[PDB]
Amino acid sequence: GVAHIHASFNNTIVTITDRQGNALGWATAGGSGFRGSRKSTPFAAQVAAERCADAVKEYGIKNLEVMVKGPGPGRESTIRALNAAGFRITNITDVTPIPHXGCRPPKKRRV
Amino acid sequence: SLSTEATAKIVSEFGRDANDTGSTEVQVALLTAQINHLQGHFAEHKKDHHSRRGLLRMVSQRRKLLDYLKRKDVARYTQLIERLGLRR
Amino acid sequence: PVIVALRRFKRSCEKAGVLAEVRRREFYEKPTTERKRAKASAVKRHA
Amino acid sequence: KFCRFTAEGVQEIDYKDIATLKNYITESGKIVPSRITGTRAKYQRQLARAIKRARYLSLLPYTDRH
Amino acid sequence: RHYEIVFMVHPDQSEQVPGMIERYTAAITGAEGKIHRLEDWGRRQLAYPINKLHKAHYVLMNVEAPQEVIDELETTFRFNDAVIRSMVMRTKHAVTEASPMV
RNA sequence: GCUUGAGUCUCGUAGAGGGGGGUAGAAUUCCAGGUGUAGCGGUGAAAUGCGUAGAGAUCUGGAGGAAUACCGGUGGCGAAGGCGGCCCCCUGGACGAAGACUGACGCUCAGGUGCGAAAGCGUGGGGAGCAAACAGGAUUAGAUACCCUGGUAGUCCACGCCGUAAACGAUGUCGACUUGGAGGUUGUGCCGGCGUGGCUUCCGGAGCUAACGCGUUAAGUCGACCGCCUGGGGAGUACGGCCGCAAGGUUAAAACUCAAAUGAAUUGACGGGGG
Numbered sequence: 131g132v133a134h135i136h137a138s139f140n141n142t143i144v145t146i147t148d149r150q151g152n153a154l155g156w157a158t159a160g161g162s163g164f165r166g167s168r169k170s171t172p173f174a175a176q177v178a179a180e181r182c183a184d185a186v187k188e189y190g191i192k193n194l195e196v197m198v199k200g201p202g203p204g205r206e207s208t209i210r211a212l213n214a215a216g217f218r219i220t221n222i223t224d225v226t227p228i229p230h231x232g233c234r235p236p237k238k239r240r241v
Numbered sequence: 242s243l244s245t246e247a248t249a250k251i252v253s254e255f256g257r258d259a260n261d262t263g264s265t266e267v268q269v270a271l272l273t274a275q276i277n278h279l280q281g282h283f284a285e286h287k288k289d290h291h292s293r294r295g296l297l298r299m300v301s302q303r304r305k306l307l308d309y310l311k312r313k314d315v316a317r318y319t320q321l322i323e324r325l326g327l328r329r
Numbered sequence: 330p331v332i333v334a335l336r337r338f339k340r341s342c343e344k345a346g347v348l349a350e351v352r353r354r355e356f357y358e359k360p361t362t363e364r365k366r367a368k369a370s371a372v373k374r375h376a
Numbered sequence: 377k378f379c380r381f382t383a384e385g386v387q388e389i390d391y392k393d394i395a396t397l398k399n400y401i402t403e404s405g406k407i408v409p410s411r412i413t414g415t416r417a418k419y420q421r422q423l424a425r426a427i428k429r430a431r432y433l434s435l436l437p438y439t440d441r442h
Numbered sequence: 443r444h445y446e447i448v449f450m451v452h453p454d455q456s457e458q459v460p461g462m463i464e465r466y467t468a469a470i471t472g473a474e475g476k477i478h479r480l481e482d483w484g485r486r487q488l489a490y491p492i493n494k495l496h497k498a499h500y501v502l503m504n505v506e507a508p509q510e511v512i513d514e515l516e517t518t519f520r521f522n523d524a525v526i527r528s529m530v531m532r533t534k535h536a537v538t539e540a541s542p543m544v
Numbered sequence: 545g546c547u548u549g550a551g552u553c554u555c556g557u558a559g560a561g562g563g564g565g566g567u568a569g570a571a572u573u574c575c576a577g578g579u580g581u582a583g584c585g586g587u588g589a590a591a592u593g594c595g596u597a598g599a600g601a602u603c604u605g606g607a608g609g610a611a612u613a614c615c616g617g618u619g620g621c622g623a624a625g626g627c628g629g630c631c632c633c634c635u636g637g638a639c640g641a642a643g644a645c646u647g648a649c650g651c652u653c654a655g656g657u658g659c660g661a662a663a664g665c666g667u668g669g670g671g672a673g674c675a676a677a678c679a680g681g682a683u684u685a686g687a688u689a690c691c692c693u694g695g696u697a698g699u700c701c702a703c704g705c706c707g708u709a710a711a712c713g714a715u716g717u718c719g720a721c722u723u724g725g726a727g728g729u730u731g732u733g734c735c736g737g738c739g740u741g742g743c744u745u746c747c748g749g750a751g752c753u754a755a756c757g758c759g760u761u762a763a764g765u766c767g768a769c770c771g772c773c774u775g776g777g778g779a780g781u782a783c784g785g786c787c788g789c790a791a792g793g794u795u796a797a798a799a800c801u802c803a804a805a806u807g808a809a810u811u812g813a814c815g816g817g818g819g
């Protein structure tokens with residue numbers, strides 16, 4: 131299968147899919163008992179990875195290609211947790227979308 | 242810009258010889274040919290302001306050379322403007 | 330950045346400059362602001 | 377360091393010469409800066425144009441993910 | 443004027459390219475142009491997918507010709523559904539030497 | 545008359561210079577399907593918002609607009625404004641090398657004319673993303689804000705108008721002259737060097753300057769012509785003229801009022817500046 135890690139600044143979503151991108155299971159830092167400051171940490175992403183690895187216990191997946199997307203805390207800790215759960219991490223690939231210019235981004239925050 | 246072959250014909254037509262490239266008559270005839278050629282460009286490309294600045298320099302330079310030639314020798318001036326179809 | 334293997338993944342992402350690119354593209358930078366930082370950094374390395 | 381194009385005395389880089397051009401792209405397919413490769417400015421501009429033409433003809437990739 | 447012309451043909455018309463090359467150069471020669479170089483690179487692997495395809499058949503042509511008949515050739519490339527992509531480029535000079543591919 | 549200023553010709557060179565047309569790849573959004581299941585999104589923390597009518601995530605296909613990562617650079621080009629994927633067509637300027645040619649044809653320029661960022665205006669298109677206004681959620685004593693979720697003009701295109709910006713080098717144009725040092729970029733000559741041009745960045749000498757600084761790209765030493773200033777405020781306002789569809793632009797006072805206003809630098813003190 132393929133592990134898709136959506137690592138945003140606020141949250142991490144881990145979706146395990148087959149090799150044709152059909153979803154098998156998923157978990158998130160926000161739905162693993164972390165809100166606010168706690169949701170956007172490497173640990174919350176580690177916990178999300180484990181619970182997602184738990185969510186696809188029935189399919190009996192051995193090998194995982196890993197697809198990392200976005201700038202967030204749970205880039206690495208999610209991948210380690212899949213290795214800790216005992217997947218054959220065959221590939222690590224960054225698929226973070228980069229425009230080749232693209233659209234005007236939102237205005238800067240004056241905080 | 243004007244081609245080598247079109248330039249060389251003008252130089253021959255209005256010059257003393259093939260190498261009289263500096264004559265006021267030759268210079269004016271060359272500017273006139275390029276000014277006339279570019280009318281087609283600017284008819285199509287009305288907002289080509291940058292290129293038009295180059296055209297207006299050709300117009301101004303021609304005016305200055307014709308003015309020089311007039312007082313230097315009006316007979317040469319009078320023939321030149323007649324041959325090229327210039328009001329002045 | 331296609332790929333001890335995890336350290337190799339970190340390094341490939343440093344070299345493509347993935348996170349620097351994403352951080353720079355979070356918010357719009359006016360051309361005046363971009364020129365200003367380009368000058369300030371040009372001056373910096375030149376010291 | 378040092379510009380190979382001045383060393384060989386090449387007139388142009390040539391978009392067809394993929395062997396050469398592949399030395400001036402990263403693994404991501406990105407054009408490598410002149411400060412890293414030591415290419416001269418004039419040749420870096422010719423190189424960038426060659427790589428862009430090659431990318432258009434699908435002789436090089438734009439990215440590692442197509 | 444001197445032009446370098448690359449075109450890519452859909453890989454299920456590799457057999458139509460000998461015709462294409464003959465017909466396109468008849469246009470050049472008939473309008474009193476030179477063919478300076480003509481190379482058929484054959485089917486190559488694309489660096490990225492073009493319209494689902496992973497391969498295409500490349501032809502290179504260096505040509506001296508009037509502007510007018512090269513304009514005719516690009517419109518031929520436009521509507522010919524076999525021709526998936528093409529580049530026409532001005533060169534300063536005629537090129538006759540073998541390309542780095544061949 | 546002359547050829548040294550200024551031009552012309554020949555051959556090349558670099559360039560995001562301009563106008564027009566075409567095309568590529570990345571990404572965002574939307575639409576249609578597949579898989580899948582309870583969250584997603586957002587913040588300092590939240591909430592509004594979105595989601596079991598199946599979101600978010602992931603995959604496939606499609607639509608559409610706008611912008612062109614890397615290259616990229618005190619890099620380049622342009623009178624300034626400005627100009628950045630790739631390809632073609634039309635086109636302007638600059639520079640160099642050899643000679644030849646014209647023979648002061650030059651410089652500057654009130655009035656005049658043209659060009660002129662962004663916003664804005666008119667008509668017709670277009671509209672992904674962004675986003676004045678606006679709406680809701682927060683924050684707060686209040687919060688017509690900053691922050692969050694949305695979002696219309698607009699931003700895009702064609703044609704016309706507007707004519708302004710800290711439109712700045714806050715430095716008018718042209719020419720001559722006057723120690724150096726270190727870079728960049730772009731020609732070219734002779735044998736990795738040694739020459740000869742153009743453009744450009746930084747430091748600094750004399751000199752200049754209130755000082756700060758400028759310093760062969762002068763703010764030095766001179767010449768030509770133009771524009772402009774004459775205490776602060778009232779005021780770039782009023783009235784009149786001209787221009788503009790409008791918004792407004794432009795030209796431009798007076799009464800009254802104050803004894804200052806101002807520049808640079810110095811010592812402190814202070815900072816929700818740094819060490």
Ligand SMILES: CN[C@@H]1[C@@H](O)[C@@H](O[C@@H]2[C@@H](O)[C@H](O[C@H]3O[C@H](CN)CC[C@H]3N)[C@@H](N)C[C@H]2N)OC[C@]1(C)O
Pocket residue numbers: 425560562563
């Ligand atoms: C306004 N029209 C322009 C049109 O003028 C042209 O732009 C050229 C641009 O192609 C050139 O640049 C491009 O092509 C070069 C070779 N010709 C190589 C470098 C490349 N960036 C610039 N040097 C000058 C622009 N005016 O092509 C693009 C365009 C937008 O259509």
Ligand SMILES: CN[C@@H]1[C@@H](O)[C@@H](O[C@@H]2[C@@H](O)[C@H](O[C@H]3O[C@H](CN)CC[C@H]3N)[C@@H](N)C[C@H]2N)OC[C@]1(C)O
Pocket residue numbers: 727
């Ligand atoms: C004032 N500093 C200069 C800097 O401006 C620049 O100077 C070059 C000089 O190197 C070039 O000349 C030199 O390099 C040439 C490279 N093709 C060959 C001939 C050689 N004399 C000149 N043609 C132009 C100057 N602007 O490079 C050298 C330098 C000393 O750093």
Ligand SMILES: [K+]
Pocket residue numbers: 519520521522523524525526527
């Ligand atoms: K076609």
Ligand SMILES: [K+]
Pocket residue numbers: 653
């Ligand atoms: K005058």
Ligand SMILES: [K+]
Pocket residue numbers: 696
């Ligand atoms: K809108």
Ligand SMILES: [K+]
Pocket residue numbers: 755
């Ligand atoms: K002092």
Ligand SMILES: [K+]
Pocket residue numbers: none
């Ligand atoms: K008025």
Ligand SMILES: [K+]
Pocket residue numbers: none
């Ligand atoms: K007064």
Ligand SMILES: [Mg+2]
Pocket residue numbers: none
């Ligand atoms: Mg040009």
Ligand SMILES: [Mg+2]
Pocket residue numbers: none
């Ligand atoms: Mg506008």
Ligand SMILES: [Mg+2]
Pocket residue numbers: none
């Ligand atoms: Mg409008």
Ligand SMILES: [Mg+2]
Pocket residue numbers: none
């Ligand atoms: Mg918004």
Ligand SMILES: [Mg+2]
Pocket residue numbers: none
């Ligand atoms: Mg907002």
Ligand SMILES: [Mg+2]
Pocket residue numbers: none
């Ligand atoms: Mg003003």
Ligand SMILES: [Mg+2]
Pocket residue numbers: none
């Ligand atoms: Mg400006």
Ligand SMILES: [Mg+2]
Pocket residue numbers: 712
């Ligand atoms: Mg400025």
